[PDB]
């Protein structure tokens, strides 16, 4: 399973780890990793957007770069340095891809939009402190936002547009309106306000207004995973207290179409949307995971154990490698082995 790993020291490691490669085994062969990039802490990697085979990389100084992995070794296809004035107090919460466009929301509320081809730059203002931002895959120009003391808001650029719209006229500052604001759940048994802190948002309308029935699930800083449905109502359809630890990030597993989540104690599990309970749990991950990525029937997990754990959709450890440095984001380059 070829995969690329980012490190906090700014260097990127291309790993050709094959099935069964487990460094904890003394007899096992180590994977052949190739490292490059700047080895300085001021350009720590943050996220591993997977634009088809192309990979887009952010940096702690905003030195966004682009790589194409069809060639070995990969080469820096494109480069971008963000303005130093929008990183003076915030940090890149996420970049995500939507129909040939790049999203670069900041924690301070600012948000930048970049087109790879047209090279158009758009700035958008939002609500208070952002901690989770996402773009709807199927429908272009649908932005979900969340953060501490700021419930989820569904910003939409095209009202319906009935199939899609041209990418140039998306995210117009006058065309963005929130078509859905999350309603905080009722007070708990103690008549205490249920503290709200969104930490990660995923859209699950495929596994469960044009193309209505927005079915998406968010997580919290209080370990409670909350689903959603605009048609049913603003409040969550269901709410579960999965973990005591704050939930780190959430996502989907296309192989079984089953939602997965992790927390800051390294407890990654595969929640079920039909049985309303956690089934299984990825065993053997020590140290909180910095980023988890999955492709088809494989999943790559990296955290403060400084390792690359590999499992399948049915949580069986395939591979394991030691990465010396501190990983920050991972991406499976190829689901199939070398």
């Amino acid at each position: 399973m070829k995969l690329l790993l980012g490190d906090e020291i700014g260097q990127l490691k291309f790993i050709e780890i094959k099935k069964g490669t487990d460094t904890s085994n003394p007899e096992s062969e180590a994977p052949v990793i190739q490292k490059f990039g700047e080895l300085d802490r001021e350009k720590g990697v943050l996220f591993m957007l997977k634009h088809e085979m192309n990979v887009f990389v952010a940096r702690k100084n905003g030195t966004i770069e682009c790589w194409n992995v069809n060639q070995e070794p990969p080469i820096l296809s494109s480069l971008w340095q963000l303005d130093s004035s929008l990183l003076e107090t915030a940090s890149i919460v996420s970049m995500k891809y939507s129909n040939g466009w790049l999203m670069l929301a900041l924690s301070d509320g600012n948000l930048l939009f970049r087109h790879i081809e047209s090279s158009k730059l758009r700035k958008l203002q939002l609500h208070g402190p952002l901690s989770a931002v996402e773009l709807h895959p199927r429908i272009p120009g649908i932005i979900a936002a969340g953060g501490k003391e700021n419930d989820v808001c569904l910003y939409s650029c095209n009202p319906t547009c009935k199939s899609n719209i041209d990418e140039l006229e998306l995210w117009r500052t006058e065309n963005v309106v929130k078509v859905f604001q999350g309603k905080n759940v009722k007070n708990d048994s103690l008549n205490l306000r249920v503290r709200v802190w969104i930490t990660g948002i995923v859209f699950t309308e495929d596994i469960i207004d044009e193309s209505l029935c927005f079915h998406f699930a968010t997580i919290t800083h209080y370990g409670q995973l909350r689903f959603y449905d605009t048609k049913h109502g603003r409040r969550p359809v269901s709410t579960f207290d999965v973990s005591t630890s704050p939930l780190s990030h959430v996502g989907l597993l296309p192989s079984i179409k089953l939602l997965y989540f992790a927390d800051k104690r390294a407890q990654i599990s595969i929640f079920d949307h039909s049985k309303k309970k956690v089934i299984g749990r990825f065993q053997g991950v020590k140290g909180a995971p910095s980023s988890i990525h999955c492709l088809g029937n494989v999943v790559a997990i990296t955290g403060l154990d400084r390792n690359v754990r590999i499992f399948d959709a049915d949580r069986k450890p395939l591979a394991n490698a030691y990465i010396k440095a501190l990983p920050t984001s991972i991406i499976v380059i190829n689901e199939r082995d070398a």
């Binding site: 630890s245 800051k264 140290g287 403060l304 400084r306």
Partner: protein, 306 residues
């Protein structure tokens, strides 16, 4: 052996078999001695081969242990970390603050004094009120401290030490054991205010290096040789041993160099076991786990993490 159920028979069967096992072990030792004294090379090769096993030698193989050759990747990562200000040309002087748990007793106040004795330039403020650890660390950041030590005491016995690195450095949580005061140490000594000389040994693994790195950051970078006070941190099977001594060299024949120092324990004396390493200020619930030990995995006594 165990087949026959009669008690007195199975004793006689063993004692007869035990005596036979000792007899043939005698003759094989004697003939080995007879042939080895005839050919000293046989003794030489046997000694060079029959090295008795030990837990350190039989240690399970883990890849995180760093090689003797210093790797550039490690230094690149560690030249800009939280403690780097203490290791760079800045040469930050670290000041320590020692606190307790809510409404503790006087047992700690006579052990934290021994802690303060081994830590010159280290204040102490007894915890008062409803202030939590995540709030002390914020306050100490603006006050002018570097690291923060807490001596949790319960049932009038101190058991856990947690320490955080200001302002946002990693937090460590050790469980103290065998904590003996300077009085309960035979041939104890009285210590002065001279700056002790740190010595850190046996921290081969990568995680152990970080824990050793933080402890190094805990000490004044300029030792006072004239006081010749030594503070020892030694890790062996994960049990970190903290000891203090006063060393005065003497002429010792056994040590082939010819010189070897006498040692006098100063106090304190305690163990630690790294229960959990956190990233960010120590939060019991909502912290990030750098490492939390599984208690069932430590049962493999040839496997370690520090």
């Amino acid at each position: 052996m165990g087949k026959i159920k009669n008690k007195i028979v199975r004793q006689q069967q063993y004692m007869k078999a035990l005596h036979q096992k000792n007899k043939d072990k005698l003759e094989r030792r004697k003939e080995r001695a007879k042939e080895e004294e005839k050919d000293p090379e046989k003794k030489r090769l046997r000694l060079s081969e029959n090295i008795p096993a030990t837990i350190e030698s039989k240690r399970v193989y883990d890849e995180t242990i760093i090689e003797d050759k210093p790797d550039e990747e490690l230094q690149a990562e560690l030249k800009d970390d939280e403690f780097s200000a203490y290791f760079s040309e800045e040469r930050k002087v670290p000041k320590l603050l020692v606190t307790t748990s809510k409404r503790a007793s006087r047992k700690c106040y006579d052990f934290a004094s021994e802690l303060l004795d081994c830590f010159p330039n280290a204040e102490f403020r007894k915890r008062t009120g409803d202030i939590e650890v995540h709030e002390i660390a914020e306050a100490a950041a603006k006050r002018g401290y570097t690291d923060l030590l807490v001596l949790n005491e319960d049932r009038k016995k101190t058991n856990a030490l947690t320490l955080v690195h200001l302002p946002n450095g990693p937090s460590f949580y050790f469980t103290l054991s065998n904590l003996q005061t300077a009085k309960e140490i035979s041939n104890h000594g009285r210590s002065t205010g001279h700056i002790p000389e740190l010595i850190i040994n046996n921290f081969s693994t990568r995680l152990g290096m970080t824990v050793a790195r933080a402890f190094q950051s805990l000490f004044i970078q300029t030792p006072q040789i004239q006081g010749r006070q030594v503070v020892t941190i030694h890790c062996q099977r994960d049990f970190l041993f903290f000891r203090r001594h006063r060393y005065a060299f003497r002429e010792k024949s056994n040590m082939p160099d010819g010189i070897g120092t006498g040692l006098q324990e100063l106090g304190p004396r305690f163990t630690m076991r790294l229960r959990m390493v956190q990233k960010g200020v120590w939060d019991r619930k909502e912290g990030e786990v750098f490492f939390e030990s599984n208690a069932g995995e430590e049962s493999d006594r040839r496997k370690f993490w520090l």
